[PDB]
Design a protein around this ligand. Structure first.
Ligand SMILES: NC(=O)c1ccc[n+]([C@@H]2O[C@H](COP(=O)([O-])OP(=O)(O)OC[C@H]3O[C@@H](n4cnc5c(N)ncnc54)[C@H](OP(=O)(O)O)[C@@H]3O)[C@@H](O)[C@H]2O)c1
Ligand SMILES: NC(=O)c1ccc[n+]([C@@H]2O[C@H](COP(=O)([O-])OP(=O)(O)OC[C@H]3O[C@@H](n4cnc5c(N)ncnc54)[C@H](OP(=O)(O)O)[C@@H]3O)[C@@H](O)[C@H]2O)c1
Ligand SMILES: NC(=O)c1ccc[n+]([C@@H]2O[C@H](COP(=O)([O-])OP(=O)(O)OC[C@H]3O[C@@H](n4cnc5c(N)ncnc54)[C@H](OP(=O)(O)O)[C@@H]3O)[C@@H](O)[C@H]2O)c1
Ligand SMILES: NC(=O)c1ccc[n+]([C@@H]2O[C@H](COP(=O)([O-])OP(=O)(O)OC[C@H]3O[C@@H](n4cnc5c(N)ncnc54)[C@H](OP(=O)(O)O)[C@@H]3O)[C@@H](O)[C@H]2O)c1
Ligand SMILES: [Mg+2]
Ligand SMILES: [Mg+2]
Lengths: 251, 250, 251, 253
């Protein structure tokens, strides 16, 4: 009945919001999980809120830190065995149009939202290919990887990059019989610290012209689609886009 | 227990993909009515999954508009109010657009398009505003996303199902109907549809078609339908769920 | 330079709106054109509003009438020579949700919007293949073949069918070296009698939350993308979706 | 038609000295535009410009699209030659034949500096310089079929072209909502016979397979030039935020 029995997952940015719920439901379904974040304070309380060191641990790591990724995999391996699942969830937002984006804002967002996903995906492939683990890489895009937003230009670029880079990775792993799948998840608006800290964002995005359901989602909405994609239930799904958005992109 | 309390109709549930959707729906607590055109096959399919306390066969052609109300009525009497409709019944025709006879055109669309419309329309009418966490799952295909030179009418039917389903999803969402509508897009799946087409599995296992080098199995489509039928997916509507071994990613 | 020199086009529903502008710009660029429509009064006016019978003629033909398609082609070939271009433009709308759509309404719309495009595409391929014509079939879909509309359920079905069926036809023609291309055009809202007759449609579609440009298009907006698709300029374009919609589907 | 379709337009075409960009510049001049082409190598660029016309209609400017400060000089130079810029074709791009697994971090950053940062610099500057001027301005960003589907041996390239695809929609929406009179669209060529393809041994043969390109051959630069003329002209005044795919059927299957 444990849908993730034997799986061991790295969830970047798993200390708040969507990443927190992903790790929560991963542990509930039998996986061992390492959550990462930049603030060690909020991190280990997040992990303790889910369970003990036998099922979940916290490793301080900036997803843009290339070298840290090797240590992150090493640490997770020593803790729970070989890594089977990578959720590249860490990401940041910038409320600027393309016109108004400074080059510093552009580079900073892309180093987390794109370079970090690249680092996790590249290393994930190298470290789990050809081990018969039913391995799965889950890259967090967004509906902003599918449609534009006039005030999120850099974010749009990063999530569109993640969308298609993930298909390249999925195809290579499939053609080479690596036993690694790569898919992208595309949440619509979700009630998280990111949305909560943007004044009026939930009210704006609950407009029926934005989200037809008339409300935004909860972090568990994204957690459950990630459980499906991490499990061997989805052993035929690779290179695909999984959209959980209240109908946002359907109009 | 992921479908606790759900009551599902699965059209074309006696073979292939539909049979596996029924199997896993029962396994997760749903009560299920499967349909098909042949009573022999249907009764054997239903008892192969469980007793009449959890699964039953109803003879119904999905293109039979009048039978759709009877089918809901029969399911409601057995199991209570329907919460879940899987419009899975469909047929194929191996013909290019150029070579498609109008008889073949009309016949395939009457099942693959008209039947999905009948089930979706009736499902909205019978499930809205009842707090059932209702979910309509419309079986499209990768052939609703990309073309196939020798499947012209099938392509037409599956593209229609893809976009019509978004219309329904939006209307239900904007009206607070408590009904979600999504489409599932399988790649090649080992089923009687594929088994009885000589050479098909060998053809579609080519890496230029399916990058995984093999075709899927009916349970690959059952598990995404379980997700879509369950309250776990309460924020998913109007979306396309593609399970295809990488077919459309290249 | 006539960008459609020597072309011979059938434009269904070419007496009003988008079809009328398509025929107008086709003859301006050197094509000979036959436009069809059901009302002979409007249709005769439209032809001579554009040119003489040496460049354009009107044929009364219902696009849903399968037998008339053979005589429409026959009549066009006898008038101007072998057809090189079919734009399947005739179409109707029904303002009903899926839930509210009667089977009568469903069947009427699809008979024109889908069956008619099928009849013209199937016969277009048969009559134009293997003739060195640089043949081009332009099937009029819509943004409603890309996104849903809660109050145009049958219309959504018809335009999604046109979108993907055309890909099948394009692939078959290209793999068999037929020298026929097949593409779909997806207008956003366009000021036409179809839109004018629906009360409030222009105002609804001009909202920025619908069309970001804040206004709807004009028939010439679709005529010019069709000239591109009918001309040999587009000899490498097949199986593709050409979206002219004021940004409607980009958000 | 009887009129120059780009009469009065002033276009910057990055990477306009070879291949697709060279053909865009050539057909732009044919349709009445004044054009500045860029590239990193002045030997190629000066010959490319003269191969199309005199300095009254086309000029070369040496500029690496990844060089942000040079973008300002490039617009200044173009304005001084021809007046206000109306059309920006972000075409400069490079390829790297590596899977995601096999991509070195320096390969990643180098390709994205050109294919992504350069398109961002040109789009941002283009909006700033062309907005609110009544020019019928148009920004054409060169994506690829590889911004629509994956390629197992072009991981960084895929990332860059997916980014260009969606970043362009953001810009199109902002320009439209603000009445800037600037449209932004992406072009998605399939395989095209260019020096880029010519220098990758076996690439044309591979992409000519029917399982890749259903027409059984790859395109030619003029195929992309003509859709760019359409997008640059006022003919396309209602087209923004959209993807224009000219690929021989590659993505239709
Ligand atoms: N919420 C939405 O509406 C929504 C919609 C679509 C997509 N998404 C995507 O979903 C993902 C999660 O978003 P969220 O809304 O849950 O964000 P959130 O509530 O702000 O949480 C982000 C998490 O990522 C961590 N993080 C941020 N930068 C990091 C870095 N450089 N290295 C490592 N960890 C980092 C944060 O921890 P520290 O602050 O301690 O680093 C935090 O745990 C993001 O990729 C976002 O783009 C969100
Ligand atoms: N297999 C694939 O590779 C694949 C891929 C993508 C999508 N799909 C789609 O998935 C669905 C299931 O396909 P499958 O491969 O499982 O097909 P299958 O093995 O041929 O099974 C078809 C099922 O539908 C029933 N059926 C056929 N016509 C019907 C009608 N008019 N009314 C009611 N029931 C009918 C059949 O029972 P009776 O014959 O007794 O009626 C049978 O139970 C179809 O919509 C198909 O288009 C399949
Ligand atoms: N206008 C828009 O906003 C818009 C947007 C996206 C797509 N479209 C599509 O563009 C196409 C043209 O639309 P429009 O707005 O130009 O329409 P319109 O103004 O209503 O004109 C439609 C034309 O088609 C003819 N027609 C209608 N039914 C026909 C039939 N069964 N057989 C032959 N001809 C027929 C009409 O003449 P008779 O009445 O005399 O037959 C008329 O000439 C349609 O496919 C529509 O779905 C329109
Ligand atoms: N060929 C295809 O099949 C194909 C398909 C889809 C998309 N594309 C895209 O189309 C665009 C043009 O490709 P192509 O095949 O024509 O390439 P190409 O034959 O290699 O020509 C590239 C042009 O860009 C210039 N260039 C390269 N790097 C540059 C930089 N950093 N700054 C400024 N200019 C630079 C080159 O000149 P210098 O080297 O002298 O700078 C040359 O003028 C690229 O974005 C490519 O990704 C091509
Ligand atoms: Mg939208
Ligand atoms: Mg493909």
């Amino acid at each position: 009945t444990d849908r993730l029995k034997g799986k061991v997952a790295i969830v970047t940015g798993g200390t708040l919001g969507i990443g927190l719920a992903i790790a929560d439901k991963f542990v509930e379904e039998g996986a061992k999980v390492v959550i990462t974040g930049r603030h060690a304070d909020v991190g280990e309380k997040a992990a303790k809120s889910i369970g003990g060191t036998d099922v979940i641990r916290f490793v301080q790591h900036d997803a843009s830190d290339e070298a840290g990724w090797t240590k992150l995999f090493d640490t997770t391996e020593e803790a729970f065995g070989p890594v089977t699942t990578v959720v590249n969830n860490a990401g940041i937002a910038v409320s600027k149009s393309v016109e108004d984006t400074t080059t510093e804002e552009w580079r900073k967002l892309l180093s987390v939202n794109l370079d970090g996903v690249f680092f996790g995906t590249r290393l994930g492939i190298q470290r789990m290919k050809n081990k018969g683990l039913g391995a799965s890489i889950i890259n967090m895009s967004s509906i902003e990887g599918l449609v534009g937003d006039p005030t999120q230009g850099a974010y749009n670029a990063s999530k569109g990059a993640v969308r298609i880079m993930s298909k390249s990775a999925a195809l290579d792993c499939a053609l080479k019989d690596y036993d690694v799948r790569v898919n992208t998840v595309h949440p619509g608006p979700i009630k998280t610290p990111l949305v909560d800290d943007a004044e009026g964002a939930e009210e704006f995005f609950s407009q029926r012209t934005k989200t037809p359901m008339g409300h935004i989602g909860e972090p568990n909405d994204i957690a459950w689609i990630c459980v499906y994609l991490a499990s061997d239930e989805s052993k035929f799904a690779t290179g695909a886009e999984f959209v959980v958005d209240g109908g946002y992109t359907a109009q």
